[PDB]
Amino acid sequence: NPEDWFTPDTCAYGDSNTAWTTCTTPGQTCYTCCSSCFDVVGEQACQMSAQC
Protein backbone atom coordinates (compact mmCIF):
# COMPACT_ATOMS: atom_id res chain seq x y z
CA ASN A 1 0.00 0.00 0.00
CA PRO A 2 1.47 3.42 -1.01
CA GLU A 3 2.17 4.80 2.46
CA ASP A 4 4.30 1.68 3.17
CA TRP A 5 6.57 1.58 0.14
CA PHE A 6 7.67 5.24 0.49
CA THR A 7 11.44 5.94 0.51
CA PRO A 8 11.83 9.61 1.65
CA ASP A 9 15.65 9.04 1.86
CA THR A 10 15.69 9.87 -1.86
CA CYS A 11 12.23 11.42 -2.48
CA ALA A 12 12.29 15.26 -2.12
CA TYR A 13 8.72 14.95 -0.72
CA GLY A 14 7.51 14.50 2.88
CA ASP A 15 4.17 12.84 2.05
CA SER A 16 3.85 9.42 0.42
CA ASN A 17 0.57 10.92 -0.95
CA THR A 18 2.16 13.99 -2.54
CA ALA A 19 4.98 11.65 -3.72
CA TRP A 20 2.71 8.99 -5.35
CA THR A 21 0.48 11.72 -6.82
CA THR A 22 3.55 13.51 -8.31
CA CYS A 23 4.64 10.14 -9.77
CA THR A 24 1.13 9.60 -11.27
CA THR A 25 0.69 13.15 -12.71
CA PRO A 26 2.61 15.20 -15.34
CA GLY A 27 5.29 17.22 -13.49
CA GLN A 28 9.04 17.06 -13.81
CA THR A 29 8.86 13.44 -12.56
CA CYS A 30 5.75 11.30 -13.37
CA TYR A 31 6.33 7.52 -14.01
CA THR A 32 10.08 7.90 -13.24
CA CYS A 33 9.30 9.26 -9.70
CA CYS A 34 7.69 5.81 -9.07
CA SER A 35 11.28 4.50 -9.32
CA SER A 36 12.99 7.41 -7.51
CA CYS A 37 10.55 7.78 -4.51
CA PHE A 38 9.34 4.22 -3.66
CA ASP A 39 10.83 0.77 -3.16
CA VAL A 40 10.59 -1.65 -6.07
CA VAL A 41 7.22 -2.91 -4.66
CA GLY A 42 5.73 0.62 -4.79
CA GLU A 43 7.62 1.32 -8.07
CA GLN A 44 5.76 -1.30 -10.12
CA ALA A 45 2.47 -0.46 -8.42
CA CYS A 46 3.02 3.25 -9.24
CA GLN A 47 4.49 2.66 -12.78
CA MET A 48 1.25 0.66 -13.54
CA SER A 49 -0.87 3.55 -12.15
CA ALA A 50 1.26 6.47 -13.56
CA GLN A 51 -0.35 8.33 -16.49
CA CYS A 52 0.96 11.63 -17.73
Side-chain angles (χ1 to χ4, degrees):
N1 56 292
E3 204 200 288
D4 204 74
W5 300 308
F6 179 44
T7 45
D9 258 316
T10 207
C11 199
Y13 287 66
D15 272 62
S16 69
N17 285 285
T18 314
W20 179 281
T21 318
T22 298
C23 314
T24 62
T25 57
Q28 45 260 299
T29 56
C30 187
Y31 180 100
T32 320
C33 157
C34 300
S35 203
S36 317
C37 275
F38 295 74
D39 293 287
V40 56
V41 197
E43 178 185 32
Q44 181 188 278
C46 174
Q47 289 188 339
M48 77 80 62
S49 195
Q51 296 186 76
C52 45

